[PDB]
Amino acid sequence: IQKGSTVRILRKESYWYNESGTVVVVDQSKVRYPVLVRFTKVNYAGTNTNNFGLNEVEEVV
Amino acid sequence: KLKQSDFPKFEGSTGGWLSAAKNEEKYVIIWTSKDASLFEMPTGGTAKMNAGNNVAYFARKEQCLALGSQLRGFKITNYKIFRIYPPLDITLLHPFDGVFPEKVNQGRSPVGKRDASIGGNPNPASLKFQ
Amino acid sequence: SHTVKIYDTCIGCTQCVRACPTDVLEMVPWDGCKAGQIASAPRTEDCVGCKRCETACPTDFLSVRVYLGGETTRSLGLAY
Amino acid sequence: KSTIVDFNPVETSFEKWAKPGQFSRTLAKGPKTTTWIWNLHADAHDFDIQTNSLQEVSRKIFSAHFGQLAVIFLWLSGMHFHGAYFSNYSAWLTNPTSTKPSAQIVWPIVGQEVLNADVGGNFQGIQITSGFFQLWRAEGITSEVELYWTAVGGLVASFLMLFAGWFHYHKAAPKLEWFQNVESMLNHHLAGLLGLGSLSWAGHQIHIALPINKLLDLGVSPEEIPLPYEFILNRDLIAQLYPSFNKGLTPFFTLNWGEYSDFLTFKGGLNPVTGGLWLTDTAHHHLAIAVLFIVAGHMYKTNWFLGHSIKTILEAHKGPFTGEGHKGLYEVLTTSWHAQLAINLALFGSLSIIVAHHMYAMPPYPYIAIDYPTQLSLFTHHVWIGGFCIVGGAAHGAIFFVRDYNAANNYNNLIDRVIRHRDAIISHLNWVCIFLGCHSFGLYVHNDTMRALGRSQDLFSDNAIALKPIFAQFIQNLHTLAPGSTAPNALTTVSYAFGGDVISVGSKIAMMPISLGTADFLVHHIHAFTIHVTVLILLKGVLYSRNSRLIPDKANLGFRFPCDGPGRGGTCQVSAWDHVFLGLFWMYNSISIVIFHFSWKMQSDVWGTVSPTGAVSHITGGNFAQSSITINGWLRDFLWSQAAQVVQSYGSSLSAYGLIFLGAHFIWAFSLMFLFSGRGYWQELIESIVWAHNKLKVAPSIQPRALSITQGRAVGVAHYLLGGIGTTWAFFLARIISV
Amino acid sequence: DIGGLNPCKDSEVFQKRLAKTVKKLENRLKKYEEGTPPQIAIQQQITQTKQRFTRYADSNLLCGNDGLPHLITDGRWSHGSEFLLPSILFLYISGWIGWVGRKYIRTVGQTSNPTEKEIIIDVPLAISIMTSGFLWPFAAWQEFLSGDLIASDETITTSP
Amino acid sequence: YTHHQYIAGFLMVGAFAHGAIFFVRDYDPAVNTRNGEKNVLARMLEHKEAIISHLSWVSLFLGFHTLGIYVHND
Amino acid sequence: GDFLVHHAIALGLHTTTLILVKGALDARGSKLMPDKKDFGYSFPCDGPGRGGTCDISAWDAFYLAMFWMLNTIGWVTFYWHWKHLTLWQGNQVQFNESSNYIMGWLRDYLWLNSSPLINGYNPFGMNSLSVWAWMFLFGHLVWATGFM
Ligand code: CLA
Ligand code: CLA
Ligand code: CLA
Ligand code: CLA
Ligand code: CLA
Ligand SMILES: CC1=C(/C=C/C(C)=C/C=C/C(C)=C/C=C/C=C(C)/C=C/C=C(C)/C=C/C2=C(C)CCCC2(C)C)C(C)(C)CCC1
Ligand SMILES: CC1=C(/C=C/C(C)=C/C=C/C(C)=C/C=C/C=C(C)/C=C/C=C(C)/C=C/C2=C(C)CCCC2(C)C)C(C)(C)CCC1
Ligand SMILES: CC1=C(C/C=C(\C)CCC[C@H](C)CCC[C@H](C)CCCC(C)C)C(=O)c2ccccc2C1=O
Ligand code: SF4
Ligand code: SF4
């Protein structure tokens, strides 16, 4: 995955679970949740972006 | 007029502390101000600061912290909050290590940190009768 | 007293600490995020349960969680 | 480049009409959830958060006032047009005591033509309870052409006010200094508006209403009555009815005002022909009011070295108990629109309630006292408007405290000292509310349980333990003795309610001494208790709007917020808005009890018919004295008994009242869904509904969200008020029109 | 007949209801004068009442013991104009409404600002879609066949 | 009749409340799942949205039309 | 009338079932609270955050469904009692005609049959039904205190 890639959220406790988002940036450092994904639908708190782990996102073909 | 010279020029309100802050605990906030600014008490109405040492007593930590948050609007930062038990048992509370909690300071250890997200919490049925 | 837990989804944006009305949360060094900081809850005895901390949390399902528990004159917000 | 106005401040364009939410910084970005739609209407008139300049807020308020006055003028024009075209006003003029006023006909669709009632005068339509016919008769309007011309003038005036609002927002908007000339504004509103309006109305009454109504009462038909302009061009048509116009204005300018006693009388009582106040008394009243208000308008210093400065008056009113006194109040009321709105709305609602009382107490229109539906509707409507306006004044006082209150500018003044001892005020008001409720209501419950136990001598009744309202009876005696003793130039008491003779017009009672017994004692103390509890809720909201022992920084959360959280044991409804919500509920309770007391007492002990020998028979038969002292009595002899007409209205011309009765019950019960439930359940149900929509690929882009907590409360209270007030509306109207 | 009911053309209580309503209307008519609009309105009411009762009598309508038309909605085509035909009419109209709404949602859902086009309707596109709903039964059973009517697993689910 | 019907409603609400309590504090997904596949009870939480949506549809259908016919008669 | 009231009963049953089933299935979590199982069966809320979380617990679903159960049982018992009052009095035509519209219920069941009850004690005397009128008023008072 990279910037601009489309991924499916696999985190169950997510307002965008099973949904598709756009990767903003994948951090190359040793952070726990490097993948930053932007969504079109705001969550219940109003935010439309979140940091996800490498195993919590699945790239769409 | 007032018991201590460092008290803010407050006329007293029926919203201050009660019998609880005489036998359980009371909170005191101290700060130094450059100007005798007029500020709003967390309990009642308007009080006047002293151009120097200021000391105020409250019944709750939240009241002292609300006053301190108001003080930040006056560019006052050196305010410090203490807890006083029924006798003179003073304990510094808010600037615990001298640095505000919003700024990272070395020497602090994480308390209540779980090395997983919310989804990793154990199922309640496995937490029965413990 | 209520229970406050911090989860590694913390991004160290400090919005929880500067929203706590009773000085329960603080920022401590960490190496799990870009900011290098994580929230901590070392003074939960002053936790009142107002949940302002998790109203300011930007992470997806929160990184600070408040579990209401036993009540105390401090946690009940009793000035009397 | 005028010194009072700014020229062409805002361009007249339709571009912002196509950008909803442009006024708000947060809503301008566009909707993302359905909460945006509701926030759009909740912030439309909150001009304080739309601009950071008091000048812009003042200009918006000024133009909004113009729009509101245009709407009011359009409404009045519609009323006059309906009177001119869809009314039996001409037939009602010739038979006021036997024709029911109707000014709205119903189209014949889906069988709804049954609503066209037999109002009399060869007319079919809905009976009108707004009293426009009596008002028009008091104005001297004897033809429907005059109603048409008044409607045309109302339309022209409405367009003029619309143009004025547009002009003063887009072409010449006044500056802040112009708005802050409270001395000049008070001078003008007191002299020009009030005094000159009273003077102009006195002139109209004297020259048009006095002769035309005197001819009408003499039996002259409206067709042979001269046109109103002929009473001005010919000093002989009015000098025959009032033989004092023959002297012209010479007695006025020679201070010989005694000559004008023909048409400027001081009689009191009611006109025996029409049952209303003597229109000569009304004209004299308006003249005196005009002179008093014009004099009162020369008080405040505006542009010369003459008059008062409100700042100097307030700052001089200090005291040992009040510290700095009224210092800073002038700055509060000249820099905060919310404080002015609070004062004006509270006094305006109180004035509306006073108007409601004085209306039925002293009927001011011809043949309006014998139109019981009109009297009941006018009283209930004005009391409801007064209660709503009072709650609004409390709400805007709380809003001022949250938003526009400056602690520094109010050091040790009255506002500061009130906040400093808010605990004492609220605790003593709590004790008073408990005392009054315990006593009034528990005396009611004691009466109920004594009656249920077969102990009739243990009640708080007249034939039992008696609580005579001696203070009110003393006042009643003082008023009935006033003519000739304390008002030596009066011929009759101000109102026959205080005592005197039974005034009947066409065998129908217009006014009659309202006896006060133990039943009135209990209901009056119920009124006092309900008013005190409403004041308690609203004052607790205003005083604790900024901080408390629970939330020391409640002002930082704003005026309108749902809570601070489940902590502190639970901090629901701590706002100040949530106090205007509970106060709205309690105002509904208080006003409902007030209007119930009025309806039952009038029907049972004032209204009715008078036999030719002088025997008085009332609508219900005097059951108020003995059966209004128990809750079972109120349930049975008032609610159950007088609800018979509403439930038996199906198939008749009053069936619409039964339908509205049922619909208002439905709406009131609907409110309880929002009042009792919470947002989380509805959000989680919307989650599954959204799942279904996504499964069918029909999920809207604007994400559907459950109504916010504050909006849920607002919807609940609005539906509750609508349902309850509509139920009482249908009940009252059907009952008082049937009988 | 069906359910013990009888045709309204032979129901005495039905004619009694008609006679009572007409008598009440005529008694109301008596208290007005000449050819005045109130009398014209009451006469129109009488005429409409008579026409409605006559039409209900000659309508294959079954009346109970109260002289009111009862609806036979078990499904039989004999009384098919009471429920079945209005049912088909409503199903057509409501399917039209739902189809045009869904088509508009899916059409503006692929533009730059989908949320803007929901508070500010694209009236040209809205008119284009709305008049295309007359084929909603055919369009629905041409999109379901192609799998374009139902989502499969991109739909979101809660934690449990 | 009134007593027994009220007791019936109370008992039904209690049954559903205790089912909810079982879900909260006694339900174990691991026991009701074998190699990824879910048993008859665990599958009720998979189409829970379908169940709730169709209950909502039936409730809205019945309420809309019963109230419509009643108000039409009114 | 039986048809319409049976459909009302079906609506009440379905709505009570909807509330209870939604609370049971959503007890372990939802989108607004994907960790609701960690807070137990009965908790006040999750705070004003995320738009507001009033009555989000499973206990609150029971609490809301109690009103609907009371309403459904009220409809059932109203139907039964009115049908049997008309059957016993003999005026079964009163139910068959007036039970098809709401005002028929309000006027001929409640308003009509409440006359003996409210006259259990009047300013003139009392009957053995006086205790029932007192209980009537007592129930109204407790109902409105619940409204409080
Ligand atoms: C004798 C002069 C006079 C008169 C009659 C009025 C009358 C009024 N003013 Mg006003 N005002 C005046 C002087 C005057 N003002 C001055 C000198 C100032 C500056 C301090 C203001 C500042 C002011 C503000 C800021 C506001 C008012 C408002 C109002 C209205 C109150 C609403 C009401 O009672 O409805 C009664 C309504 C009527 C009786 C309808 C007929 C009234 C018409 C419009 C005559 C208005 C007179 C007007 C001043 C003449 C100017 C004409 C123009 C070509 C120059 C009322 C129309 C309020 C309002 O509603 O805004 C529109 C409001 O917000 N006034
Ligand atoms: C002169 C009268 C007056 C004026 C100028 C204002 C002005 C204001 N009020 Mg206010 N208020 C008033 C009277 C008034 N109020 C009264 C009498 C009450 C007591 C009920 C209140 C209670 C009140 C509260 C509790 C709040 C305000 C707020 C506000 C501000 C924003 C209003 C807004 O955007 O609403 C836009 C308009 C609407 C949303 C319209 C809503 C529709 C209403 C609720 C239903 C009306 C139904 C109608 C009768 C028809 C029903 C018939 C049915 C058959 C269909 C604004 C400064 C709010 C604020 O934030 O202030 C800063 C706020 O929180 N007011
Ligand atoms: C019928 C229902 C009902 C009743 C009885 C009350 C009663 C009361 N409300 Mg209210 N309230 C109601 C509905 C009701 N409310 C609703 C629906 C709402 C929603 C908006 C509110 C919202 C509300 C607010 C927001 C406030 C109140 C307040 C009050 C209190 C006013 C003080 C008073 O009179 O106390 C006296 C008590 C009574 C009159 C109740 C009856 C007591 C009897 C007659 C006498 C004593 C009986 C005796 C002790 C029995 C002993 C025997 C027993 C042990 C077996 C009072 C307790 C105010 C408050 O806190 O008090 C100051 C207040 O601020 N209420
Ligand atoms: C117009 C598009 C549309 C479509 C195709 C559907 C389709 C559906 N809805 Mg639905 N709904 C819509 C709009 C729509 N809805 C709107 C606008 C609302 C808000 C009031 C709802 C609220 C809603 C609820 C609360 C529920 C459904 C349910 C359902 C499902 C069962 C059918 C039902 O109960 O109808 C429900 C229909 C209504 C309650 C009335 C809808 C209001 C109007 C008629 C629709 C709007 C028309 C729109 C403005 C047209 C504009 C298009 C034009 C610009 C081209 C089905 C998937 C149920 C479900 O999940 O069952 C599986 C369910 O519980 N919907
Ligand atoms: C045989 C049946 C049965 C059994 C064994 C239980 C057992 C249990 N239930 Mg349960 N429940 C039942 C039926 C049953 N319930 C029914 C029928 C309902 C629907 C109404 C419920 C609704 C329910 C809920 C919502 C909850 C429980 C809970 C519980 C658990 C704790 C109970 C507790 O703390 O009591 C506490 C007892 C009380 C608070 C006493 C309440 C007394 C009420 C108010 C009536 C008293 C007023 C009385 C009529 C006075 C008359 C007034 C006069 C003027 C006429 C326990 C395992 C709780 C739990 O945590 O489960 C794990 C829980 O949250 N149940
Ligand atoms: C009903 C109505 C209307 C109408 C109204 C009107 C018509 C009014 C009028 C009004 C008027 C018509 C007024 C007038 C006024 C006047 C005046 C107010 C005057 C005054 C004067 C004076 C004050 C003088 C004084 C003097 C001098 C200065 C010198 C010499 C001496 C003397 C003393 C004489 C409209 C349509 C709008 C709307 C609806 C309602
Ligand atoms: C018609 C007929 C018949 C049949 C009948 C039948 C077949 C019936 C059935 C019935 C049924 C079939 C019923 C059922 C019901 C059910 C119910 C009523 C249920 C409920 C449920 C619940 C309550 C649940 C709970 C829970 C949950 C929530 C989850 C967890 C677990 C539990 C389980 C706890 C016969 C042939 C015999 C004869 C006659 C005719
Ligand atoms: C039902 C309900 C909802 C859901 C309600 C919603 C989503 C409102 C939906 C309104 C629709 C979409 C528009 C209005 C449709 C009406 C037919 C229009 C009004 C009728 C006119 C005559 C005015 C809440 O969000 C809520 C929040 C807090 C406490 C209680 C409740 C609550 O009870
Ligand atoms: S509740 Fe949330 S906000 Fe209030 S103190 Fe405990 S943590 Fe800080
Ligand atoms: S949600 Fe309802 S309950 Fe939970 S905190 Fe906000 S207000 Fe109090």
Automatic annotation (TrEMBL), chain A:
InterPro entries (alphabetical): Elect_transpt_acc-like_dom_sf (IPR008990), PSI_PsaE (IPR003375)
TM region positions: none
Database matches in Pfam families: PSI_PsaE
A Gene Ontology cellular-component term: photosystem I reaction center
Leader sequence residues: none
Gene3D superfamilies: 2.30.30.50
SUPFAM superfamilies: Electron transport accessory proteins
Superkingdom as given in the UniProt entry: Eukaryota
Mode of membrane association: Peripheral membrane protein
Record's subcellular location: Membrane
Any one GO BP annotation for this protein: photosynthesis
Key words, A-Z: Chloroplast, Membrane, Photosynthesis, Photosystem I, Plastid
Primary role: Stabilizes the interaction between PsaC and the PSI core, assists the docking of the ferredoxin to PSI and interacts with ferredoxin-NADP oxidoreductase.
PANTHER family: PHOTOSYSTEM I REACTION CENTER SUBUNIT IV A, CHLOROPLASTIC-RELATED, PHOTOSYSTEM I SUBUNIT IV
The family this protein is said to belong to: Belongs to the PsaE family.
Protein's name according to its UniProt entry: Photosystem I reaction center subunit IV
Species the sequence originates in: Nannochloropsis oceanica
TrEMBL record, chain C:
UniProt keyword annotations, A-Z: 4Fe-4S, Chloroplast, Electron transport, Iron, Iron-sulfur, Membrane, Metal-binding, Oxidoreductase, Photosynthesis, Photosystem I, Plastid, Repeat, Thylakoid, Transport
EC numbers on record: 1.97.1.12
Iron-sulfur is among the record's keywords: yes
Domain of life: Eukaryota
Main localization (coarse): plastid
Cellular localization per UniProt: Plastid thylakoid membrane; Plastid, Chloroplast thylakoid membrane
Cofactor annotation: [4Fe-4S] cluster
Catalytic activity from the UniProt record: reduced [plastocyanin] + hnu + oxidized [2Fe-2S]-[ferredoxin] = oxidized [plastocyanin] + reduced [2Fe-2S]-[ferredoxin]
Topology term for the membrane: Peripheral membrane protein
PROSITE patterns: 4FE4S_FER_1, 4FE4S_FER_2
Binding note for cofactor: Binds 2 [4Fe-4S] clusters. Cluster 2 is most probably the spectroscopically characterized electron acceptor FA and cluster 1 is most probably FB.
Domain 4Fe-4S ferredoxin-type: 1-30, 38-67
Cellular-component GO terms for this entry: chloroplast thylakoid membrane; photosystem I
Annotated positions binding [4Fe-4S] cluster 2: C20, C47, C50, C53
Biological process, per Gene Ontology: photosynthetic electron transport in photosystem I
Residues binding [4Fe-4S] cluster 1, per UniProt: C10, C13, C16, C57
Pfam families: Fer4_7
Subunit structure: The eukaryotic PSI reaction center is composed of at least 11 subunits.
PANTHER family the UniProt entry points to: PHOTOSYSTEM I IRON-SULFUR CENTER, PHOTOSYSTEM I IRON-SULFUR CENTER-RELATED
Record-given protein name: Photosystem I iron-sulfur center
Source organism per UniProt: Nannochloropsis oceanica
Organism lineage: Eukaryota, Sar, Stramenopiles, Ochrophyta, Eustigmatophyceae
Gene: psaC
UniProtKB/TrEMBL annotation, chain D:
Catalytic activity: reduced [plastocyanin] + hnu + oxidized [2Fe-2S]-[ferredoxin] = oxidized [plastocyanin] + reduced [2Fe-2S]-[ferredoxin]
Record's keyword terms, sorted: 4Fe-4S, Chlorophyll, Chloroplast, Chromophore, Electron transport, Iron, Iron-sulfur, Magnesium, Membrane, Metal-binding, Oxidoreductase, Photosynthesis, Photosystem I, Plastid, Thylakoid, Transmembrane, Transmembrane helix, Transport
Subcellular location: Plastid, Chloroplast thylakoid membrane
Chain sites annotated for binding [4Fe-4S] cluster: C563, C572
GO CC list: chloroplast thylakoid membrane; photosystem I
Transmembrane segment boundaries: 66-86, 147-169, 341-361, 381-403, 424-445, 521-539, 580-600, 656-676, 717-737
Residues annotated for chlorophyll a' binding in this entry: H665
Listed name of the protein: Photosystem I P700 chlorophyll a apoprotein A1
Upper lineage: Eukaryota, Sar, Stramenopiles, Ochrophyta, Eustigmatophyceae
Gene: psaA
TrEMBL record, chain E:
Top-rank taxon: Eukaryota
Alphabetical UniProt keywords: Chloroplast, Membrane, Photosynthesis, Photosystem I, Plastid, Signal, Transmembrane, Transmembrane helix
Protein biosynthesis as UniProt keyword: no
One GO BP: photosynthesis
Keyword flag Kinase: no
Stored InterPro entries: PSI_PsaF, PSI_PsaF_sf
PANTHER family: PHOTOSYSTEM I REACTION CENTER SUBUNIT III, CHLOROPLASTIC (PTHR34939:SF1)
Protein's name in the database: Photosystem I reaction center subunit III
Organism from which the protein derives: Nannochloropsis oceanica
